[PDB]
Design a binder for this molecule. Structure first.
Ligand code: CO
Ligand code: CO
Length: 315
């Protein structure tokens, strides 16, 4: 197949009628669109989890997103959002390390990490870099300063490599930089995160946190909010001037990478209808150095699980 297809589902972990209705359409589209993995922006569990054996794992994830015939057995690349950090965050990390299951495979090897992949098009190979960030760790409220700095430095290293070897670069996190939703974005991330993304010619920043769907396009970068996996908060005040689409509908996204670019379909759980299709052209990059890809892979930061003791820093 000459495409790479993935779905995005954010802020999904809450027992609501919306969650269950959304899950039905999610499964339908994943099968019919031939989605091969899922990414999860925003938070996972709206009320957090209490530990590894919290019934919430079964009740809000396993029993919601399972299907027979292995139709949902694929990677579920996730990150934490602010709602996860107020509970047993370490439990989600330990699950994220790790016989097939009926539900997707939970992947979160660290609070921030990357996944580089590739696909063939028509004799030619295109490479996609997925970079996963923890927007709370990157914030000024994170109390461990060394861990905070390491997360920023790893991000810079990941983007530096992606610039040299990736035709597509997609970043996934919790807090949006730009949003017409409740948070109204983050000037902090606009000042510190956005310049790194622009320097690396990132295609998409996919976030959640705000419980809506949106695409804001600025300087050939799409900011996608996909935070309505279980809940909806309404239209809010005045739309961002570069907003192309906004919906408070409970839903999800399906994304297609091809020789021509990225097509994102926003799906509403109201009746499983695609209510917006966003198309981003593939970039013509002068920074690529694919002949020496291995040497650039060798500059990526090690993906190690970080111990973040709940007691906070001492000394
Ligand atoms: Co700082
Ligand atoms: Co907030």
């Amino acid at each position: 197949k000459c495409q790479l297809r993935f779905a995005s589902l954010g802020d999904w972990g809450k027992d609501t009628k919306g969650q269950i209705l959304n899950a039905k359409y999610f499964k339908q589209f994943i099968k019919n669109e031939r989605v091969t993995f899922i990414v999860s922006p925003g938070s996972n569990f709206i009320d957090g989890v209490k530990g590894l054996n919290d019934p919430a794992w079964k009740n809000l994830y396993e029993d919601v997103y399972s299907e027979e015939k292995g139709d949902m057995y694929m990677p579920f690349f996730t990150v934490l959002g602010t709602r996860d950090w107020t509970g047993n965050y370490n439990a989600q990390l330990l699950k994220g390390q790790g016989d097939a299951t009926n539900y997707p495979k939970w992947i979160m090897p660290n609070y921030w990490y990357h996944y580089f992949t590739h696909f063939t098009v028509s004799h030619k190979d295109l490479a996609a870099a997925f970079i996963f960030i923890d927007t709370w760790v990157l914030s000024s409220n994170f109390p461990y300063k060394k861990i905070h700095e390491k997360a920023w430095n790893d991000l810079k290293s990941q983007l530096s490599v992606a610039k040299k070897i990736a035709d597509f670069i997609i970043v996934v996190g919790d807090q949006p930089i730009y949003s017409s939703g409740y948070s109204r974005g983050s000037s902090y991330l606009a000042y510190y995160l956005l310049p790194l993304l622009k320097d690396a010619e990132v295609d998409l920043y996919i976030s959640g946190h705000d419980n809506n769907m949106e695409v804001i396009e600025d300087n050939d970068m799409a900011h996608i909010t996909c935070g309505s996996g279980s809940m909806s908060q309404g239209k809010s005040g005045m739309k961002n001037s570069k907003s192309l689409f906004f919906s408070s509908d409970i839903g999800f996204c399906v994304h297609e990478l091809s020789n021509n670019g990225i097509v994102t379909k926003f799906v509403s759980s109201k009746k499983g209808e695609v209510i917006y299709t966003h198309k981003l052209n593939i970039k013509k990059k002068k920074t690529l150095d694919k002949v020496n890809a291995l040497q650039h892979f060798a500059a990526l930061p090690n993906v190690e699980l970080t111990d973040v003791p709940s007691s906070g820093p001492m000394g």
